[PDB]
Design an enzyme around this catalytic site. Sequence first.
Site, PDB file in Angstrom:
ATOM      1  N   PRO A   7       0.855  -1.187   0.000  1.00 54.36           N
ATOM      2  CA  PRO A   7       0.000   0.000   0.000  1.00 54.36           C
ATOM      3  C   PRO A   7       0.897   1.246   0.000  1.00 54.36           C
ATOM      4  O   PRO A   7       1.883   1.286   0.739  1.00 54.36           O
ATOM      5  CB  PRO A   7      -0.756  -0.116   1.320  1.00 54.36           C
ATOM      6  CG  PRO A   7       0.177  -0.926   2.229  1.00 54.36           C
ATOM      7  CD  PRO A   7       0.924  -1.853   1.321  1.00 54.36           C
ATOM      8  N   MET A   8       0.580   2.223  -0.843  1.00 53.44           N
ATOM      9  CA  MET A   8       1.354   3.456  -0.910  1.00 53.44           C
ATOM     10  C   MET A   8       0.375   4.606  -0.972  1.00 53.44           C
ATOM     11  O   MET A   8       0.006   5.060  -2.056  1.00 53.44           O
ATOM     12  CB  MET A   8       2.259   3.502  -2.142  1.00 53.44           C
ATOM     13  CG  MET A   8       3.342   2.439  -2.178  1.00 53.44           C
ATOM     14  SD  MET A   8       4.405   2.505  -0.743  1.00 53.44           S
ATOM     15  CE  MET A   8       5.586   3.702  -1.336  1.00 53.44           C
ATOM     16  N   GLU A   9      -0.065   5.055   0.196  1.00 55.09           N
ATOM     17  CA  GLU A   9      -1.053   6.118   0.261  1.00 55.09           C
ATOM     18  C   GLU A   9      -0.464   7.388  -0.330  1.00 55.09           C
ATOM     19  O   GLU A   9       0.610   7.826   0.082  1.00 55.09           O
ATOM     20  CB  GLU A   9      -1.472   6.361   1.703  1.00 55.09           C
ATOM     21  CG  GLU A   9      -2.850   6.910   1.817  1.00 55.09           C
ATOM     22  CD  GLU A   9      -2.850   8.373   2.135  1.00 55.09           C
ATOM     23  OE1 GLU A   9      -2.255   8.734   3.184  1.00 55.09           O
ATOM     24  OE2 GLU A   9      -3.447   9.144   1.339  1.00 55.09           O
ATOM     25  N   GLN A  68      -7.146  -2.534   3.253  1.00 50.75           N
ATOM     26  CA  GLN A  68      -6.432  -2.310   4.496  1.00 50.75           C
ATOM     27  C   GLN A  68      -7.189  -1.346   5.408  1.00 50.75           C
ATOM     28  O   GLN A  68      -7.771  -0.359   4.938  1.00 50.75           O
ATOM     29  CB  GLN A  68      -5.047  -1.737   4.224  1.00 50.75           C
ATOM     30  CG  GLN A  68      -4.245  -1.575   5.477  1.00 50.75           C
ATOM     31  CD  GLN A  68      -2.877  -0.990   5.242  1.00 50.75           C
ATOM     32  OE1 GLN A  68      -2.733   0.214   5.017  1.00 50.75           O
ATOM     33  NE2 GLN A  68      -1.851  -1.833   5.326  1.00 50.75           N
ATOM     34  N   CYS A  98       2.374   2.344  10.043  1.00 49.91           N
ATOM     35  CA  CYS A  98       2.318   3.783   9.722  1.00 49.91           C
ATOM     36  C   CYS A  98       2.080   4.641  10.965  1.00 49.91           C
ATOM     37  O   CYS A  98       1.407   5.673  10.896  1.00 49.91           O
ATOM     38  CB  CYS A  98       1.237   4.100   8.672  1.00 49.91           C
ATOM     39  SG  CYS A  98       1.671   3.829   6.916  1.00 49.91           S
ATOM     40  N   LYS A 126       0.276  -5.778   9.061  1.00 51.11           N
ATOM     41  CA  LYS A 126       1.535  -5.222   8.590  1.00 51.11           C
ATOM     42  C   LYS A 126       2.214  -4.469   9.739  1.00 51.11           C
ATOM     43  O   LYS A 126       1.613  -3.599  10.361  1.00 51.11           O
ATOM     44  CB  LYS A 126       1.287  -4.295   7.386  1.00 51.11           C
ATOM     45  CG  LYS A 126       2.554  -3.743   6.709  1.00 51.11           C
ATOM     46  CD  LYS A 126       2.187  -3.167   5.347  1.00 51.11           C
ATOM     47  CE  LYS A 126       3.349  -2.476   4.699  1.00 51.11           C
ATOM     48  NZ  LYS A 126       3.610  -1.191   5.395  1.00 51.11           N
ATOM     49  N   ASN A 187       9.502  -7.109   3.905  1.00 50.48           N
ATOM     50  CA  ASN A 187       9.309  -5.846   3.214  1.00 50.48           C
ATOM     51  C   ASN A 187      10.429  -4.874   3.550  1.00 50.48           C
ATOM     52  O   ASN A 187      10.948  -4.862   4.681  1.00 50.48           O
ATOM     53  CB  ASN A 187       7.928  -5.263   3.572  1.00 50.48           C
ATOM     54  CG  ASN A 187       7.765  -3.801   3.151  1.00 50.48           C
ATOM     55  OD1 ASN A 187       7.583  -2.926   3.997  1.00 50.48           O
ATOM     56  ND2 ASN A 187       7.806  -3.538   1.837  1.00 50.48           N
ATOM     57  N   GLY A 188      10.804  -4.067   2.559  1.00 51.91           N
ATOM     58  CA  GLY A 188      11.711  -2.951   2.766  1.00 51.91           C
ATOM     59  C   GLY A 188      13.011  -3.111   2.002  1.00 51.91           C
ATOM     60  O   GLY A 188      13.737  -4.089   2.213  1.00 51.91           O
ATOM     61  N   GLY A 211       7.198  -1.864  -2.243  1.00 54.58           N
ATOM     62  CA  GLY A 211       6.497  -0.598  -2.320  1.00 54.58           C
ATOM     63  C   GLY A 211       7.131   0.341  -3.320  1.00 54.58           C
ATOM     64  O   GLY A 211       6.778   0.333  -4.504  1.00 54.58           O
TER      65      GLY A 211
HETATM   66  C1  LIG Z   1       4.363   7.298   0.289  1.00 48.97           C
HETATM   67  C2  LIG Z   1       4.202   6.067   1.148  1.00 48.97           C
HETATM   68  C3  LIG Z   1       2.923   5.641   1.497  1.00 48.97           C
HETATM   69  C4  LIG Z   1       2.738   4.516   2.294  1.00 48.97           C
HETATM   70  N1  LIG Z   1       1.446   4.133   2.620  1.00 48.97           N
HETATM   71  C5  LIG Z   1       1.230   3.014   3.396  1.00 48.97           C
HETATM   72  C6  LIG Z   1      -0.068   2.608   3.716  1.00 48.97           C
HETATM   73  O1  LIG Z   1      -1.048   3.230   3.304  1.00 48.97           O
HETATM   74  N2  LIG Z   1      -0.253   1.488   4.503  1.00 48.97           N
HETATM   75  C7  LIG Z   1       0.837   0.781   4.969  1.00 48.97           C
HETATM   76  O2  LIG Z   1       0.667  -0.217   5.669  1.00 48.97           O
HETATM   77  N3  LIG Z   1       2.120   1.180   4.650  1.00 48.97           N
HETATM   78  C8  LIG Z   1       2.325   2.284   3.859  1.00 48.97           C
HETATM   79  N4  LIG Z   1       3.620   2.663   3.550  1.00 48.97           N
HETATM   80  C9  LIG Z   1       4.763   1.805   4.032  1.00 48.97           C
HETATM   81  C10 LIG Z   1       5.074   0.906   2.797  1.00 48.97           C
HETATM   82  O3  LIG Z   1       3.959   0.122   2.389  1.00 48.97           O
HETATM   83  C11 LIG Z   1       6.288  -0.016   2.904  1.00 48.97           C
HETATM   84  O4  LIG Z   1       6.234  -0.822   4.068  1.00 48.97           O
HETATM   85  C12 LIG Z   1       7.575   0.818   2.864  1.00 48.97           C
HETATM   86  O5  LIG Z   1       7.561   1.665   1.733  1.00 48.97           O
HETATM   87  C13 LIG Z   1       8.818  -0.063   2.805  1.00 48.97           C
HETATM   88  O6  LIG Z   1       8.806  -0.836   1.621  1.00 48.97           O
HETATM   89  P1  LIG Z   1       9.723  -0.435   0.340  1.00 48.97           P
HETATM   90  O7  LIG Z   1      11.143  -0.286   0.802  1.00 48.97           O
HETATM   91  O8  LIG Z   1       9.630  -1.546  -0.690  1.00 48.97           O
HETATM   92  O9  LIG Z   1       9.179   0.845  -0.267  1.00 48.97           O
HETATM   93  C14 LIG Z   1       3.835   3.784   2.746  1.00 48.97           C
HETATM   94  C15 LIG Z   1       5.118   4.211   2.390  1.00 48.97           C
HETATM   95  C16 LIG Z   1       5.305   5.355   1.594  1.00 48.97           C
HETATM   96  C17 LIG Z   1       6.693   5.817   1.218  1.00 48.97           C
END
Ligand SMILES: Cc1cc2nc3c(=O)[nH]c(=O)nc-3n(C[C@H](O)[C@H](O)[C@H](O)COP(=O)(O)O)c2cc1C
EC number: 1.3.1.-
Length: 290
Positions: A7-9, A68, A98, A126, A187-188, A211
Amino acid sequence: MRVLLAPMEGVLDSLVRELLTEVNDYDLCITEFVRVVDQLLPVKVFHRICPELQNASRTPSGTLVRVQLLGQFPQWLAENAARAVELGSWGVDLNCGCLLKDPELIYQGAKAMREAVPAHLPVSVKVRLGWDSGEKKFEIADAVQQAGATELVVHGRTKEQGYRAEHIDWQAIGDIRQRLNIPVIANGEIWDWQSAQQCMAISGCDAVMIGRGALNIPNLSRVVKYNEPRMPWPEVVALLQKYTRLEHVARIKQWLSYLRKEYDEATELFQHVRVSPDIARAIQAIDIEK
Ligand SMILES: Cc1cc2nc3c(=O)[nH]c(=O)nc-3n(C[C@H](O)[C@H](O)[C@H](O)COP(=O)(O)O)c2cc1C
């Protein structure tokens, strides 16, 4: 191997989901969170965040999507979880990254949801490694398993470590996985085929969530699963052209900003389109080649 779209809000919505899932093999996408406080949210809110609910919880190309929830009060997490499911959601996810520095709150929230969602449908949670420390990341993990949750996504950093690359701890994710009896989705900092392989070898996870990388490389799910090469810049452009025809998007500039990390050709196109939505024409104009 399972690959989940994070999820990427403010970055990923139903439109980008439909776009990306078309040229990917994601096993599941998690929607941006539905914020829950003390009310049952109206049906319309769920349909708007998750249009897929009317398409049997799938993007048009057929990739599953899960709603979610984000919140603290177990009662309301439960009622909103039930509604998500009634409307067609393939299970429900709980955002605890978050966020919750008390494993008891995660325990109560996830339990209420598990009991409220039909047992044959998944309830996922998560989390991060911790608030200001990864100490008893096991407490959090134990909480989730004991609640009856189906699977656990672990963002391999504490809350304080934010998004700093040097703080990613896939080994910690491994220690959690060794202890639990539900799937742990790592993740990450998974950006490409090799970093995915490193992550899975260290954590022992056969499931990852991606993400930010999924925007830096539009076909990252296929890159990770099959060592497919990164989508070629002409195809990226063709995809951004399709994005404009999907209908108001200032996320286009945001996406182009992400693409600058991976594609050299993106930095010029970013400057061009930065500085009205005539941007649609500009993008649609480009002949592919090149
Ligand atoms: C812009 C943005 C929005 C995000 N929105 C959510 C969200 O809505 N719900 C959630 O559980 N995590 C959210 N995250 C956390 C990410 O889903 C993820 O755990 C984090 O980016 C690490 O993964 P990555 O390194 O592959 O990007 C968000 C992260 C970013 C940067």
